[PDB]
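sry for the spam today, last one i promise. struct tokens for design, 313 residues
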């Protein structure tokens, strides 16, 4: 438990979970939401305050999570940083890279920790693969497929789904995109319901990333290819398999050993929030800062522009 005054700005569906975590691991002053009823129920459930304004929240805390709609991230984070308050912003960072540039600048001027909520970085399989030190993968192939739900029309297939694997790509490789091509399929509306991007980075890595909001059953998978290894990750079922050239148990693939990696299930959002607060308190680097958030944001905008161009021809 960290000794820190914390708050959440925006306590809808996911903001409430942020608030639960902060209440468990820090001194949660309370919450603010534009819908007063909703803040009031969140505060009643967590036994914190429901604040009458964002400013009165900010007066009583050192750090906040910002879990408001993406188009509001800039204005809210601007107010929060003007008050010298550190910020964990839910992904995606902002709507465009100029807002992200401005908040990075204001954060540096204020000597504030700026973290973006890119939860997939703290997934147990990704942590294990980073600690294995395999180097930059040469090829990544990923699928993020979500069933159509009443709210799916507000799911941006690139900015809300694919951005996870775009970010993972940029992190595991440490490289920058040189070429982005993409296709999209729009069934319900003019907006893509599924998209697939083919990204070439400046170290020669290729990422082949699919996302959909209209599938039957969920699917969250990533296959990763190095020169001497193959990693298969089921994010949903929390499983990891690593193949190397070996001693013969794998059917249909000769001369390879499949190592089933024993992954522990942990609370990802609790992990991300503890990391944010430790970064403030120890001055150590946070799991995903503003710079990385903007990197993936620029890539995702490239993908989306390509997708909308495909769909419009
Ligand atoms: O992501 P989700 O899945 O949590 O989506 P969501 O819409 O469930 O949660 C969004 C929350 O943000 C709140 N909100 C919107 N604009 C705000 C603002 N300017 N300041 C504070 N709160 C604001 C909404 O009232 C809602 O509670
Ligand atoms: O089980 S795995 O996760 O190892 C791969 C899948 O079986 C297959 O759908 C895709 S692949 O094997 O051709 O890359």
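last one done:
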């Amino acid at each position: 438990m960290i000794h820190m005054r914390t708050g959440v700005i925006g306590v809808g569906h996911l903001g409430r979970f942020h608030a639960q975590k902060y209440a468990a691991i820090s001194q949660l002053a309370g919450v603010f939401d534009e819908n007063a009823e909703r803040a009031a129920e969140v505060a009643a459930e967590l036994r914190c305050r429901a604040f009458p304004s964002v400013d009165a929240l900010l007066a009583e805390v050192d750090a906040v999570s910002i879990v408001t709609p993406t188009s509001t991230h800039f204005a809210v984070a601007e107010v929060a940083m003007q008050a010298g308050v550190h910020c964990l912003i839910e992904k995606p960072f902002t709507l465009d890279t100029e807002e992200a540039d401005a908040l990075i600048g204001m954060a540096q001027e204020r000597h504030l920790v700026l973290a973006i909520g890119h939860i997939k970085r703290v997934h147990p399989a990704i942590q294990y693969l980073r600690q294995a030190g395999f180097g930059a993968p040469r090829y990544l192939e990923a699928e993020r497929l979500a069933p159509f739900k009443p709210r799916s029309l507000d799911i941006d297939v690139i900015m809300d789904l694919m951005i996870h694997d775009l970010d993972l790509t940029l992190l595991l490789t440490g490289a920058e995109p040189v070429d982005v091509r993409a296709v999209g399929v729009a069934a319900v509306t003019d907006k893509a319901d599924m998209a697939t991007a083919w990204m070439t980075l400046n170290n020669g890595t290729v990422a082949n990333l699919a996302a959909s909001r209209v599938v039957r059953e969920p699917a969250r998978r990533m296959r990763i290819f190095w020169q001497d290894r193959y990693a298969s990750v089921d994010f949903l079922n929390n499983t990891l398999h690593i193949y190397h050239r070996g001693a013969g148990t794998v059917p249909g693939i000769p001369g390879v050993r499949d190592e089933a990696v024993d992954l522990a299930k942990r609370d990802a959002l609790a992990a991300e929030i503890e990391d944010f607060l430790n970064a403030i308190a120890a001055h150590r680097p946070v799991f995903c800062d503003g710079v990385a958030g903007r990197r993936v944001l620029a890539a995702a905008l490239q993908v989306r522009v390509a997708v909308e161009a495909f769909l419009q021809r």
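Residues 223, 232 surround F8U (ligand 2) (CB under 6 Å). ok im logging off now
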